[PDB]
Amino acid sequence: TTFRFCRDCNNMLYPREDKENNRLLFECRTCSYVEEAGSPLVYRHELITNIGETAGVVQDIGSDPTLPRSDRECPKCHSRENVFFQSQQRRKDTSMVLFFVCLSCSHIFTSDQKNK
Amino acid sequence: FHLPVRLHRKDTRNLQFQLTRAEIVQRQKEISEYKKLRRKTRQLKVLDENAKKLRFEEFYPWVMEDFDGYNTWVGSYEAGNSDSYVLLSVEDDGSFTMIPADKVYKFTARNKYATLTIDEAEKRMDKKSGEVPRWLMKHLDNIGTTTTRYDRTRRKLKAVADQ
Amino acid sequence: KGSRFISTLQVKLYGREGSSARTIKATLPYIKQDIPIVIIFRALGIIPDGEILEHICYDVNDWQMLEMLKPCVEDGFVIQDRETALDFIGRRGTALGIKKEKRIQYAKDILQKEFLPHITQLEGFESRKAFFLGYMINRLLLCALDRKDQDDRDHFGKKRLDLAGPLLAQLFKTLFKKLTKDIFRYMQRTVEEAHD
Amino acid sequence: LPHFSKDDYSPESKGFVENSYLRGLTPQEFFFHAMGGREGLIDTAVKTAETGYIQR
Amino acid sequence: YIPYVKTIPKKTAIVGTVCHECQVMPSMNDPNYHKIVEQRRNIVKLNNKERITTLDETVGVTMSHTGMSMRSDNSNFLKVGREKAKSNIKSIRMPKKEILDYLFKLFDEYDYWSLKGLKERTRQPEAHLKECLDKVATLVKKGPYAFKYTLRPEYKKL
Amino acid sequence: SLMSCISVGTDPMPIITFLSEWGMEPLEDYVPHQSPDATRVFVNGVWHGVHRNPARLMETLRTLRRKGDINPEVSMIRDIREKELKIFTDAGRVYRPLFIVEDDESLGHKELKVRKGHIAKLMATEYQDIDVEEYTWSSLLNEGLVEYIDAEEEESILIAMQPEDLEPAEDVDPAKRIRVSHHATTFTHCEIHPSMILGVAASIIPFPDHNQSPRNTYQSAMGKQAMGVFLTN
Amino acid sequence: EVFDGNDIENNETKVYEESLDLDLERSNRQVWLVRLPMFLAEKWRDRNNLHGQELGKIRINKDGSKITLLLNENDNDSIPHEYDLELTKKVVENEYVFTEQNLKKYQ
Ligand SMILES: [Zn+2]
Ligand SMILES: [Zn+2]
């Protein structure tokens, strides 16, 4: 959605329509600052969302002694050490697919063979 | 800023209906032209002297106002990093002079976008309507209500320059 | 250490998943009403909406969390400065001795000495209170977004066992308070009724 | 338990006792078996009180 | 607007603009380094608070100050009863012919006299003093100046 | 349980001061959008600041606790994923001891820090009472061989049931029970002995792992109704 | 030091014998905000000190990117003599230093 914030007061901008040009403008509700939008999308509802599948991956994820290790091959550096974990979305509708993080290039790949 | 600038301590209540320095100067000009038993026993609760001193000293926050009221910043006392800072002033010879720091104040601008009042705000918060109109501030700006100190002073100053 | 009393702060996500507007309201001690979180943030000195969101969400591209926060900033739009927000807090308080002008300070004191007391109770720590409040809101939103599961109440790591030490500690604290109260009452009675 | 790795779904991880009483339960099996036993003891107490009221 | 704001003026001056924020950190390649590490380790090691003190005296001796004790308190603290009870003196009723005149000069001084103030100035017993006061003055109880004697209008209106 | 203990709590101020000196940037200058990797530092549930290098801070904190500068009862947890560093000093937390496992590359695999030389002096002090220098449980604690761990810190550690088979890198008797190896090479601790999970009443049962669990519960209750010698006086 | 507010009566002309305006004259003065360790801040923030002596020297590489502080030999060889000034912020804006003292009250 790419929230936009005002330049002069840092408040949130809102979409407005200018019929003189039939375009989309983003204006502030208190200080009268306007800016033309770069994209025509203003709202998005994600009923089925995948944001958070790999949440929590950091530069030292391999230091975690509790994460299980695997021998799968990383298809970006050809290394065999890696830590894997299941999806981090706590909806009781997510698949049991695994996510692998390589301990040599920080690349994240998956075991999915259905859709990938 | 529009010089001169004043940095004093003052009450911040109703810091939208306080006379600007320029307005006061103009009013001074026209004024000159115009004239031309207790319970006998109570308990005090011990309070650390330092906090009471801090409470009394910081009761009236710093207010930084320019001449025309265009800039009005209110300072707030910060205690997280107040007494661990040190200042090095670069003299005009390459050298450094060290000065301990006393306090840190965080200043936030006031009255730049024509804020409402508490009574007006509460009427809108209550079910006057399902939700406040998106462009209410723009609408009320044209009616003339809810102006700023800067505009409230400029129109008065122009009301004098016109004569 | 110091007073042993407990004050609870609750941050509630009103509305269900089938609603068109779910706002967040926080319960403050001695206020009698659940205030929108934005109003509390402005009462702490953070007026810009962008800064408030920065205190809540720590990722600039987590639009899904920001989308759920937009109704909150919309609810408290009519208040746009520290003093008006404080007066909004104060008039909800249950004191009715504050008239209209001691009422801003009353809310300020409530936010200082009774709001999130376990961080501090001294003047000049609004930034810590705002950051912690954002931390609570962030965790609330993470669970509401099916990114975290509700905290397990039986997790033995969130429990404490009070032994004879703490048990006798609170008993002694209560009894010593009563003893001191009796001492002063005797002092007052001796001063007034003219005794030795 | 803090003896397996995160996201482990093998039978040994989620409470499958592979041994018999003759051979002896391992410490993980002993605790999981105890958890199941506690369920029965609680059920016995609660159902006894509730069925008694139903009978009356 | 508001005509009074109750400011507090002070002498202020901007005496510099911050250009760099610095963090002083001791160099690890310094000889005296690792003395700071020990100092920082002593910060957590320290036990500034001290334990309660146990009395090793005979228990009977320690309890000799408690309860019904043969010893008498020598304290002068909050002996309010002693302060005002000590002072006491009697006064004999003086002749009416003199006090009667004294009250009139007094009433000429002020047009309203309280009872406590009157007894203090006259320094006479309230018993006799009441007789003359009622004979000369009257007390208004229900008026705003309640419980205050004032000279009767017969002699005041002169 | 037999080896369970409850902390009495200490002052958190010394730890907060220690954190400030080692780069725990205060919370008054934290810009979340200019440091989207900083670890939030909590002490007794109070967000005191952030740290740019949590790994070194945790290493320094753990070493200090093990050598005996921070009280062993203090619990330190590093939620690497959540980017949080929680320190608990309050009283009322239940903890228990565990062996410490370190690499010790001399053999090339992780192994307990406690060796047979230590055990020799442990029993030497045990039997000299019935005079070598005293060597007690505290000596194990101060030498970094055992570690108090509470339920919250237990969430971030990997524990081996025995050092016999789990620690060594990796016919069978048909009568022995089937033991699962778990084939993990990242153990951080080891159980002193699994039997210590039981309490006072269940520690008198012989072969409680060859019984159905409710029978063990019944005996625990009934063993308190048995006549014996409650005291010698 | 309580005083009137708006002051349309022009009472500041006699109640105060000094200008009440903020002095924007020394603002163009470079200043470094330095955070000190506890052992160093406990002896540099002392008001029974700071007699104008040389606390040490500040050394900057000709090409920049590295600064170091060298204290004198007055520390009594109990603390390090060499420190590294770590620039947590090279460019700083909206931060200023302002003083505060009382005004002369008569005439
Ligand atoms: Zn704006
Ligand atoms: Zn790789």
- Asked if residues C29 and C110 have their Cβ atoms less than 8 Å apart, the reply is yes
Cα separation of G68 and F133, whole Å?
49
Question: Any contact of E with D, at least 3 CB pairs below 8 A?
Answer: no
- How far is residue G88's CA from residue A34's CA, in Å, rounded to a whole number? 35
Residue tagged 């967040």 (tokens): C24
CA distance G34 to chain B (A): 5
For D31, F44, F58, F149, G71, the CA distances from F86, given in Å and listed in that order, are: 29, 8, 10, 14, 37
CB distance C72 to C26 below 8 Å? no
Return the CATH number at F17: 3.90.1070.20
Q: For residue B146, is it left (φ>0), alpha (ψ between -120 and 50) or beta?
A: left
Cβ neighbours around B101 below 10 Å, total: 16
Hey, which residues does E26 pair with through a beta bridge? G83
How many Å apart are CA C132 and CA C119, to the nearest integer? 9
Q: Is A46 annotated as a binding residue?
A: no
> Looking only at Cα atoms, what is the longest distance across chain C?
75
Q: Within this chain, do residues F75 and F105 fall inside the same structural domain, yes or no? A: no
C-beta neighbour count of E88 within 10 angstroms: 6
Neighbours of A29 (CB within 10 A): 23
| End-to-end CA separation in angstroms for chain D | 44
F residues 33-72 closer than 8 Å to A (CB): 37, 55
Q: Residues E59, E52: contact at Cβ < 8 Å?
A: no
Cα–Cα distance for residue pair C62/B62, rounded to 1 Å: 37
- The C-alpha torsion from B72 through B76 and B82 to B88, rounded to 10°, is 0
Asked if F69 and F102 sit in the same domain, the reply is: no
When CB atoms are compared, the residue of B10, B87, B89 closest to E6 is B10
The token duo for B85 is 């800072």
Determine whether the interchain pair F17/G37 forms a contact, defined as Cβ–Cβ distance below 8 Å: no
What burial letters (b/e) apply to D6-16, b meaning 16+ CB within 10 Å? Answer: eeeeeebbeee
Residue D19 CB contacts under 8 Å (≥ 6 apart), including other chains = D25, D26, D29, F177, F178
- What subunits touch chain B, counting only 3 or more CB pairs under 8 A? A, C, E, F, G
Contact predicate E107/E132, CB 8 Å: no
Tell me which residues have their CB within 5 A of the ion that is ligand 2: A 74, 77, 79, 102, 104-105, 107
C-alpha distance from residue G19 to each of B127, B162, G22, G23, G105 (Å): 51, 31, 8, 9, 12
Which residues, including other chains, have CB under 8 Å from residue F55's CB and lie 6 or more apart? Answer: A60, A63
Shortest distance between the Cα of F52 and any Cα of chain A, in A, equals 12
Q: In what order do the strands lie in the sheet with A98-102?
A: A69-70, A82-86, A98-102, A108-110
The answer to whether residues E44 and F65 touch, using CB atoms and an 8 Å cutoff, is no
Contact C40, C28 (CB under 8 A): yes
Q: Which residues pair with F229 in a beta bridge?
A: none
Please tell me whether residues F99 and F70 are part of one structural domain: no
Residues from F contacting D (CB-CB < 8 Å) are 154-155, 157-161, 175-180, 182, 184, 191, 194, 197, 207-214, 216-217
- Measure the CA–CA gap between C95 and C32, rounded to whole angstroms: 10
- Which residues of E are less than 8 Å from C187 in CB distance? 78
D55 by DSSP, 3-state: which? helix
The span from the CA of F118 to the CA of F134, in Å, is: 12
Which residues in chain D are contacts of A98 at CB distance < 8 A? 7
CA distances from residue G5 to B15, C12, F87, G9 in whole angstroms, order as listed: 13, 44, 51, 10
> Distance (Å, rounded) from C-alpha F169 to C-alpha F186?
11
| Strand partners for F147 | F98
Whether F58 and F15 map to the same domain: the answer is yes
Q: Which of C81, A34, C76, A29 is nearest to B139 (CA)?
A: A29
Domain co-membership, F25 together with F121: no
C142-145 — which CB contacts under 8 Å span 24+ positions? C142/C65, C144/C13, C144/C68, C145/A52, C145/C64, C145/C65, C145/C68
Token duo for residue A8? 């002069």
Q: Same structural domain for residues F124 and F183?
A: yes
Would an 8 Å CB–CB cutoff place B46 in contact with chain G?
Answer: no
How many Å apart are CA F53 and CA F78, to the nearest integer?
Answer: 12
Q: How far is CA B114 from CA B1, B15, B144, C80, in A?
A: 19, 12, 11, 9
Q: After which residues is chain B broken (C to N over 2.5 A)?
A: 36
Q: Which residue has the tokens 């001891």?
A: F97
The answer to whether B and F touch (≥3 CB pairs < 8 Å) is: yes
Q: What is the DSSP string of A10-38?
A: -PBEEEEEETTTTEEEEEETTT--EEE-S
Q: Taking CA atoms, what residue in B is nearest to C92?
A: B122
* Rounded Cα gap, residues E139 and E145, in angstroms: 9
Angle at which helices E126-136 and E96-109 cross, to 10°:
60
Chain F contact for E34 (CB, 8 A cutoff): no
Where in the sequence is the domain holding F183, given as residue range(s)?
91-199
Task: Kindly state the greatest CA–CA separation across chain D.
Answer: 51
Annotate G49-63 with b (16+ C-beta within 10 A) or e (fewer). eeeeeebbebeeeee
By the CB < 8 Å criterion, does B114 face chain A? yes
Distance from CA of D54 to the nearest CA of F (A): 27
Helix (H) or strand (E) holding B31: helix B21-35
Residue B69 contacts residue B112 (beta carbons within 8 Å): no
| Rounded Cα distance, D12 and F8, in Å | 37
8 Å CB contact of B87 and G22: no
Give the other-Cβ count within 10 Å of C100's Cβ: 11
- CA-based nearest distance F188→chain E, Å: 25
Cα gap E132→E125, rounded to integer Å: 12
Partners of residue F27 in chain B, C-beta under 8 Å: 80
Tell me whether residue A6 is annotated as binding: yes
Rounded to whole angstroms, the Cα distance separating B52 from F32 reads: 34
CB-based contact A27:A36 (threshold 8 Å): no
**DSSP track, G18-55:** S--S-B-SS-S-EEEEEE--HHHHHHHS-TT--SS---
Is A102 assigned a ligand-binding role in the annotation? Answer: yes
- Give the neighbours of chain D: at least 3 Cβ pairs within 8 Å: A, F
SS3 F3: coil
Query: Which residue in the block uniquely carries the two structure tokens 């004979």?
Result: E135
The sheet with strand C24-27 has its strands ordered as C10-13, C24-27, C34-36
Terminus-to-terminus CA distance in chain C, angstroms? 36
Q: Of C119, C117, C102, C110, whose CA–CA distance to C43 is shortest? A: C110
The two three-digit tokens of residue B22, written as one number: 């320029």
Residue F133 CB coordination number (10 Å): 9
How far does A104 lie from chain B, in Å, by closest CA? Answer: 40
Is residue F178 within 8 Å of F147, Cβ to Cβ? no
Q: How many Cα atoms within 13 Å fall on the side-chain side of residue F214?
A: 9
Collapse the DSSP code of B7 into the 3-class scheme (helix H, G, I; strand E, B; otherwise coil) and give the result: strand
Give F175's contacts in chain D (Cβ within 8 Å): 23
Inter-chain CB pairs, B–E, below 8 Å: 33
8 A C-beta contact, residue F178 and residue D20? no
CB F73 within 8 A of CB F95: yes
- Residue A38: CB atoms within 10 A of its CB come to 10
Contact of E147 with E141, CB cutoff 8 Å: yes
The SS3 of residue A83 is strand
Is F80 close to A59, i.e. CB distance below 8 A?
Answer: no
Strand F94-102 versus strand F111-112 pairing type: antiparallel
Residues 6+ apart with CB under 8 A from F223: F201, F204
Could you write out the DSSP letters of every residue in chain E?
-BS---EE--EEEEEEEEEEEEEEEE-TTSTTTTHHHHHHHHHHH---S-PPPPP-S-HHHHGGGSSS-SS-----TT-HHHHHHS-----PPPPHHHHHHHHHHHHHH-S-B-HHHHHHHH-S-HHHHHHHHHHHEEEESSSSSTTEEEE-HHHH--
One domain for residues F109 and F70 = no
- Expressed in angstroms and rounded, the spacing between residue B122 Cα and the centre of ligand 1 is 22
- Of C106, C73, A10, residue with least CA distance to B13: C106
Residue A79 assigned ligand-binding role: no
What lies within 8 Å, CB to CB, of E8 at 6+ separation is B8, B9, B10, B60, G1, G2, G3
> What Å resolution does this PDB entry report?
2.9
- Count the Cβ atoms, other than its own, within 10 Å of residue B47: 9
C-alpha span between C91 and B135 (Å, rounded):
28
Pick the closest to residue F8 from C164, E3, B100, A104 (CA basis).
Answer: C164
- Residue C54's domain comprises 1-152
- Contacts of residue F211, defined as CB under 8 A and 6 or more positions apart, other chains included, come to D21, F205
Q: Identify the residue whose tokens are 């029970």.
A: F177
Angle ∠(B46,B52,B58) on CA atoms, nearest 5:
165
* Cα distance between residue A68 and residue A72, in whole Å: 12
Q: A30 and B137 in contact by Cβ < 8 A?
A: yes
AA letter at F17: T
Residue of D2, D18, D21 lying closest to F210 (CB–CB): D21
- The answer to whether residues F135 and F170 belong to one domain is yes
- CB–CB of F172/F94 below 8 Å? no
Token pair recorded at residue A36 = 């033309």
Whether omega before B4 lies within 30 degrees of 0, making that bond cis, reads: yes
Whole-angstrom distance, CA of residue B26 vs CA of residue B156: 9
Tell whether A74 is in a known binding site. yes
A42, A15 Cβ separation under 8 angstroms:
yes
SS3 B32: helix
CA dihedral A7, A9, A12, A13 (to 10 degrees): -50
What are the residues whose beta carbons fall under 8 Å from the beta carbon of B55, sequence distance 6 or more? Answer: C123
Angle of CA points B41, B47, B51, to nearest 5°: 145
User: Is A28 labelled a binding residue?
Assistant: yes
Calculate the dihedral angle through the C-alpha atoms of C103, C108, C111, C112, rounding to the nearest 10 degrees.
Answer: -140
Please list, in sequence order, all residues whose beta carbon lies within 8 angstroms of the beta carbon of residue E158, skipping any fewer than 6 positions away: none
How far is the C-alpha of C53 from the C-alpha of C38, rounded, in Å? 9
Q: Which two tokens stand for residue A29?
A: 């509700």
* F172 in the same domain as F72: no
How far is it, in rounded angstroms, from Cα C92 to Cα B19? Answer: 30
Q: Which two tokens stand for residue F190?
A: 């080891």
Q: Residue C121: which residues within 8 A CB-CB, separation 6 or more?
A: C112, C113
How far apart (Å, rounded) are the C-alpha atoms in residues C121 and D31?
45
CB-based contact B68:B158 (threshold 8 Å): no
Task: Give the separation between CA F209 and CA D19, rounded to whole angstroms.
Answer: 10
Backbone φ and ψ for G68, nearest 5 degrees, come out as: -145, 145
DSSP character for B113? S
The answer on F186 and F108 residing in a single domain is yes
Q: Which residues sit opposite B104 in a β-bridge?
A: B78
Same domain, F26 and F126: no
How far from the centroid of its chain's Cα atoms is residue D49's Cα? Answer: 22
Domain boundaries, chain A: 1-45, 46-116
| CATH code of the domain covering residue C74 | 3.90.1110.10
Rounded Cα distance, F66 and F145, in Å: 8
Residue by residue, DSSP assigns C4-59 as ------EEEE-S-TT-S---EEEE-TT--SEEEHHHHHHHTT---HHHHHHHH-S-
Asked whether the beta carbons of E36 and G37 are under 8 A apart, the reply is yes
E156 backbone dihedrals φ, ψ, rounded to 5°:
-65, -40
Closest CA to B113 of B87, B151, B160: B151
* A116 annotated as a binding-site residue: no
Considering only CB atoms, which chain B residues are within 8 Å of A31?
112-113
- Both structure tokens of C3: 């007073």
Residue B163 host element (H or E):
none
Beta strands, E only, A1-114: 13-18, 23-28, 34-36, 69-70, 82-86, 98-102, 108-110
Give, in degrees to the nearest 5, the angle at Cα F29 between A11 and C109. Answer: 75
Residue F168 CA, chain-centre distance (Å), reads 21
Residues from chain C that touch F92, judged by Cβ atoms under 8 A, are: 160-163, 166
* A66 annotated among ligand-binding-site residues: no
d(CA E9, CA G6): 12
HEC secondary structure over B38-101: CCCCCCCCCCCHHHHHHHHHCCCCEEEECCCCCCEEEEEEECCCCCCEEEEEECCCCCEEEEEC
Specify the residue for token string 């000596």: F139
CA Rg value for chain D: 16
Which phi and psi (to 5°) does residue F169 adopt? Answer: -65, 135
Question: Residue G33, Cβ neighbours under 10 Å: how many?
Answer: 23
Buried b (16+ CB within 10 A) or exposed e, C34-69: bbbbbbbbbbbbbbbbbbbbbbbbbeeebbbbbbbb
Q: How far apart, in Å, are the Cα atoms of C121 and each of A98, C111, C126, D9?
A: 47, 9, 10, 48
Count of CB atoms within 10 A of residue E127's CB?
Answer: 8
Tell me phi and psi for residue F71, to 5 degrees.
Answer: -55, 135
Residue F98 β-bridge partners: F147
> F53 and F95 in one domain?
no
A109 Cα–ligand 2 center, Å:
9
